[PDB]
Structure formats: C-alpha cells, structure tokens
C-alpha cells in the first residue's frame, strides 16, 4: 500500500543533506587524530592516509576508547535486574522465595553475559566506541537470532544510516543503507530483485534500504526493507517504542538537533593548533638535516684537495675557511617546544592518559600522592555518563525481549527492571561490612547484659541490608536446638549399640562362631 | 559509626567479666549514654534472663537427654541376642547383620 | 632532540616501555610504574578486532574437523565459545566467595545469625550460580 | 587442512602474495583464490594424475601454479571449493564448506569498509617512520664526515 | 637470491615490530586454555536433572 | 500541591529577589577572560616562531642560487655570517606572560 510515508529511497536523500554538517566535521575530526578511522568515503584503494604531524590524537583516542570500554563494560556482570521489592513482598510468601526470585535474576544476568561474550559484542561495541569518540552518531542493529548459531551485530558509522528525530528526544524515522551484493543477498530479497526483472551479475551491489518510521495512530514503530522496488514482502515489523533492534547511540547530547556531537571535536581546534607546531618543529629539523659546506671564497682552501684526499692526508688550507650552513633558531626552537609541551599537557588531561614523558619529569612525585589519578577517573566519569542512557540501557532492553522469543531465557514476570550499576557491588560490600561488625560481637557471647539479639539487628538496620532472612525467627530454634541433640542422639546411640551388640556377640565362644555365620563367614577367624 | 564505636568501648570491658566490684551492667549503659545511641533494645531487661538462663539449660537438657536414651535404648536393645533380632525387625531389617 | 622525540612517540604507539633513548633519569619509582598498564590498555585496543577475525574462526573450524576424525566427542549442538582472556571468572568468583565464607568461621556457635542464609547471600551477590552450592533438605 | 590421521599436521599460510579474496561492502566473503607453486615431484597423488592426464612429460623439479577457488555458491549459502591446474579441475575437488566453518579464513588487521582487504597496524605510523629514518640517515652521515 | 635487504637507518621499526608481534602472541594466545565452551545454561537446566 | 510538584527549578548560587539564579563559573568568568587573552598571545608568539625566514645579508657573497640547488654535501661559495634567520625575539617577554 501507500504506507503513509513515501518513498524510503527519498527519505534517505532528503536527509542526506543533514549529515553533511556532521559528516564534514568528522572527516576533519578524524584527520587530526587517526585518518583510518573515518574516511571521506570518496575514498578507495588506494588512498593512503597520511599520519598527522602530532601523535597525541592517535594516542589519546585508543587510550580513551579502551578506558571507556574498560569502564562501561567490565568482564563481570555489568547489568543487574532489580525486582520491585515491595511488589515482590506482596506476591510472595516471605523470605525464602524472595532470594529465590533473585536467583532467577542472577540466572538471567549471567546468560546475557554469556550471550554478549559468545557473539563478539565486545568487538563491535569497541568499534562503536571509536566511532563515538571521532564522530558520535552510530546506530548498531541487533538482528534476530534464528537459532543458537553465531550472531554478531552490524553497526553503521553515519555514512550508512540516516535518522531524524525531534527537538524532543524521541526518534521519528531511521533509514539504513546497505550495499549487499547480489550473490550475498538474503533469500527473500533475491526473489524481489529477480521479481523486479533483468539478470544481475553475481558480484553487483544493491542499495538495500530500511525505513524504521514511527507509526501513524500507534506508538510502535513500523519497519520495512526495500530495494529499488517498493518493498520486499518480508518487511513489516511491529517494533515497540521501548524495544527496537536499531538504536542510535550519541556522544554528547545536544538539543534539538537530529544527531549528536562527538567528544573529540571539543578539542579538535586545539589539535589543529598542536599539529601546526609539530609540523614546524619537524621541518626545522629537516633544514638541520641538510649538510651544506660553506667555503669562504676569500680563502685558500680549495676542496679539490678536500674531497680527493685519503683517510689521513695532509692538505693545504686554513680551518676557518670551511664552515657549515647550520640551522639557527636556538632561542626560537625552545619557544615552539615549550608551547607544544604545554598544549600536549592540557590535552593529556582532557584524554584519560596519565601525565607522562613529555616534560622533564622529574617525579619525585611519590608515593601515595598519585591517588590524584582518581581525578582522571572522575573526569572519565563525566564522559560516559550520557552514554549509559543512550547505549547501555537500550542494549539490555532489546536483549531482554529477543531472548524471550527464542526461549533462551525464562519469561521474567513483567516487573523486573535493570540498572547499569558499575554490578553488585552494593549487595556484596554491604554484606561484607556487616559481617565484620558482627565479628566484633564475638567476645560478647557470654555477656549477660548486652542484647546481642538486637545489636545484630541494629547493624542490619544501619547498613542497608534488607532483613528477615537475616535472623532466626521465633520457632526456628527449637528445630535448631533439636539438631544438636539429634546429632548427639545419633552419635551416642550408634556408639552405644555397636559397643552393645559386638560385646555380647562374641562371648562364650559358641556365640562367636554363630555371629560370623550371620555375615556369611566360615571358620577362618 | 556510633554503633561501631560503642562496640570497641564495650570490647575493652572484656577482661572485667570476673571483676566483682565494677558495675558492668551500668558502664555499658554509660557508654550507650555518652555515645548517642538511643537505648532500650540495647540491654537485657528485668525478665529477659530467666528466659536466657533457661536456654543454656534447655540446650544442656536436650543435649544430655538425647545422649542419655540413645545410649539407654541401644544398650538394652541388643543384649541376650534374641532381642537383637527383634530390634532389627522394628526398623524393618531382616537377618542381614 | 627531534629524533629522540619521534622515537618517544613511536615507543608508546608500539608496546615497548619507555627506555634508554633519553637522559633517563628514573627516579620514577617504585609503585608509579603501574602506568605500564596504560600500555596494556593501548594493547587492548589493538587485538580487539583480531579476536573476531582470527580467534573465533580458528576454533569453529577445529570444533568441526575434530568431530569428523573422532578425536573429539560430538558436542550436542548447543555449546558455543567465547575467547575469554580462560576462566578466570569461574576461578576468581569462586575464590572470592570462599574468603567471605571464611569470615563466618567464628560465627558457628552464634544462635541468632542465619548462617544458612548469609552463605546464600554471598553466593547471590557474587555471581556464582547455585544449587550445588548448599546442602539441600534431605542431604544431612 | 584435514587431518587424515593423528600424524603431524601443520597449517599453511599465504601472505597476500599468494592469495586473492574478494568480499562485499558487507562483511562477508564472496570468493577466494589461493596460488600454490607445488613442484611436480612434490605434488599430491590425485593432481599428478591430472597433470599427466593433461599430457606431456614434466621435470621432477618443475613448479606448477596450483590454484583453488572457494567461491560462494549460487542458490545455497555454503561455499564451493575446487582445486585446479592449467586444466579445468582435478576431480578430487568439490568441497561443501559451510558458511561458518571453512578451513580458509582470511585474517584482517584494522577493518575498513567496504574494501576487500584490510589495512595494517604499522602503516598507521609508516609516515612517521619515514621521517624518523630521514633524521637517523643524517646523524650517521654527519658522523662519517667526522 | 641474491637481493640483500639493506637495514633501515633507524632501528625502531625492527624493534617495535617484534616487541609488538610477541606481545600480541603473549596476549591473544597464552599457554593456558584461552578458549572455553559455554553451554547455554537455561537450556542446560531444561534437558537435564 | 505546593510541596510536591514534578517541575522543580534548580538554582546555582541563590540571589534575592531576582527570578532566576546565577551560576558558579560566572564568578570566575572575568578571570577566564583574562587567562584566554594571555594564552591567545603565547600561542600566536609561537606561530611567528614557526615561520622560518632566511634573511640573506645583501652586502655579502652568498647567493642562494647555489644554496638551494646544491646536493646533500656540496661545497658552496660563501661566508656563514651572511645567512641568518629571522627569529622571534621576546625572550624576556615570553617569561612575563607565562
């Protein structure tokens, strides 16, 4: 049908004239740091990428993309599923069932970490974080599993997608551009391309578009793929607003523009000035590198004898005729060096590398004083804080849905939500701290006055551990007092009759021969 | 912190559990009064101990009691060996041992 | 001094340590060289592409070729592999919950603390799985 | 390669002067061609029947450009793999390699789309080495006039 | 043979390659068990006692 | 209600009785305005420094028709004291502004 917005190949073309501000920023912004990261895409093989004269942008990007990956995504359990605790108390008989629910929540949070690591999501997120530094603005598509086989996720680094969003935060429509070759197309698309007509080469590429527009009269998204034809008839997906496999990530958020900025465009002016110094210092060393022999032409020394002489010949002439053209700028090389060492000093804090070689340095700064490296962690804490909303939560809310449909996860009952805690964490340390406070009460087990039954509740109240699996309740002890007794009942009892039977089993020796026959032993002993 | 500090002050009173003169029932209240922890879940009240003195006794009552009859039954359950075969049938054991 | 500055900014790009080619002049000592971990993190960005390209297809071929020559048992269609840099997570999360349970050792005679539950909470906080973790109902 | 027993089985590599792959702007591989230069006495047994089957005697040490072709199949997602000589095939050829498990895997330092091959890591500083040699060439030559 | 390979005037590239190829080999491929096989844990609970 | 409304306006340093609040870093915005005007000048002093001008003494012998076209190590006519380079001055002034 007309499908209320048309056409998807032209929605990409109307809004391609909106990437061109951000795209020509990133082509400039990758030129100074690392040119292989975001090409101009009027680029082929060959177009060799000249290294920038400065190597701080190449340094301070890998040292910032990895320190985001190490901080956003540690190897352990970076998400956790909080059940709403008061609504968990109502629907359940306390207290054993409550932690039994949290074992099912500890079940799921390990399966996702066994799903993320076993599908190389760590790879394509690190390729995402390098795009988020240089350009921002990457959407990565999480396809349906269709089995327990290998399932990566494809990203699109702003030269292959288009989104359009509001001045308000929500997304209106997305267009992604593939260039899948004809032999490599999926099966339903090859029926549509052949259904369009005309034979194709095995290696000819096809601009395959998607269109993920927000629906008329319903809050969910509609998603249809297309070719040069209208649709592909495997198209329509009813993606809800909160769970769509296409999520556009965003380095630093700015309203109400459609895309996001990047982090390293906020220092791209400063790299532009630091390369212009480092271009000049190197070129001053190249005039230096040339060795010109200035012969004083009012002198005696002809170098017709200086060249053709051997290892140690005696030659005519004065030494003060032969001087060499040397590069001047002794007091000028230090001006351009001390500024370039000051600009690298104030970019090395902007990026998360430590203070390092590029000074005298001269540390004596020792030894507990380098806890001010935590100032780099706090400055790092301001960097990804936007990104934990934009990437880190929608990547879980998609995988909580897609694993329900493929039955690789239990259907969690509509009430559990997740924070991206940088990981408990709070459940471990608050349990570990109240143990040591209760361990100080160990010499008070014989004190007749202190209510140790209450102090252990007060520390469990001061430290915010919950309660009610925390202490033995009213009944709960007559069972426990019996178990020490039933132990000593079974212990003294089994030691009684075994001494009781075997003493009288072998006395008045005819009974000893009768006792051995019951086991089946003949008269051996 | 106010709970953690009053523990260490009460922990210094540990070698005074046998001193017949110092009112350790009062010093633990004074430190609970000096440090602003509240009170009244803080100490064992008047009754509160005859229950507690019974629980050490009911423990030793259940412990020595369960060790008595288990030594008491099983000694006389297997003597004059016809009683031993009768005792194994009550569990359901035939003549295996 | 330029050639000592270009070698200085290639020696961080490659994973060798800062070295001879200056005055050097370390006094930089002794716990301060934990910033050599910055070279490991820069190294962590290098092979991260390569673990998808080399390190996973080399296993998925050998998981097939050893089935055909019967040098491996036919694993039942549901096991997949990460290239964890190696457990690892199974060892450290087991080693950490032992030391937390070892602090509960002077509480074996305390009549109030539910030690049957605290050992489950630490097994719940640390993401060790459960159910081989504790003695069940009969079991005693 | 396939084991064919518990004997010694290394793996052969090809450092870009002995293979050719062609892949899409999309990540997947379309076709691969590997070039061997196996000598005539050192050829495998089925290939010697094809070279003699082509005709003409060969020297014991003459090399033969032995090609493979690992193209993605028409109408099926698996790969097809056939070896060849100057002749058409070798009749020990056809292997139904699946998409996820093929013994020929092309490795790739830093990935760039949608070019067929990958770049290298040390070409990202090859300009800077080019400037650092031009200094170190001059310092040494200043010591030789010295 | 012969075409003798002249050494570059600088020896950082010869240094920084072996010191980077080995530190990839030591990090990608340690001597112990660098892969492991994860079974899908919830589907392992269903098919098993 | 007055005490519970979902729209709450936050306020860095409170000042009465104006409708809005000030900001913290406007209390040093004058000082940043002076510190950029120094750091703008130090960088621009390094850019005159960056340009490499070869001042040939025109009362001398050295013609650079031989200085350019010479090879790696040629013997050329001339005195070294003719070729000097236009360098940025301000040795005792760069330290004042630094």
Residue numbers in the entry:
A (entry chain E): 6 to 427, 434 to 536
B (entry chain D): 440 to 536
C (entry chain F): 343 to 427, 434 to 488
D (entry chain F): 148 to 293
E (entry chain F): 50 to 98
F (entry chain D): 245 to 342
What text appears in the publication on this structure?
Another two independent local reconstructions focused on the portal and tail, respectively, yield the structures of the portal and tail at the same resolution of 3.8 Å, suggesting that the portal interacts firmly with the tail. The T7 portal, which exhibits a canonical 12-fold phage portal structure, is formed by 12 copies of the 536-residue portal protein gp8 arranged around a central tunnel. Each gp8 can be divided into five domains of clip (294–334), stem (335–356 and 269–293), wing (1–268, 357–427), crown (428–492), and C-terminal helical barrel. The tunnel is 140 Å in height and of variable tunnel diameter. An extra rim of the top opening, which is formed by 12 C-terminal α-helices (α14) and loops, interacts with the core. A rod-like density that is approximately 20 Å in diameter and lining the middle of the portal and core channel could be assigned to dsDNA; this is similar to the rod-like density observed in the P22 portal.
Escherichia coli bacteriophage T7, a member of Podoviridae, has been used as a model for understanding the DNA packaging mechanism common to tailed phages and related dsDNA viruses. The phages package genomic dsDNA into a round procapsid using the portal in complex with an ATP-dependent terminase complex as the motor. At the beginning of phage infection, the tail is responsible for receptor recognition, and the portal and tail act as a tunnel for DNA delivery into the host cytoplasm. Here, we determined structures of the DNA packaging intermediate and mature capsids of T7 using cryo-electron microscopy (cryo-EM) and symmetry-mismatch reconstruction.
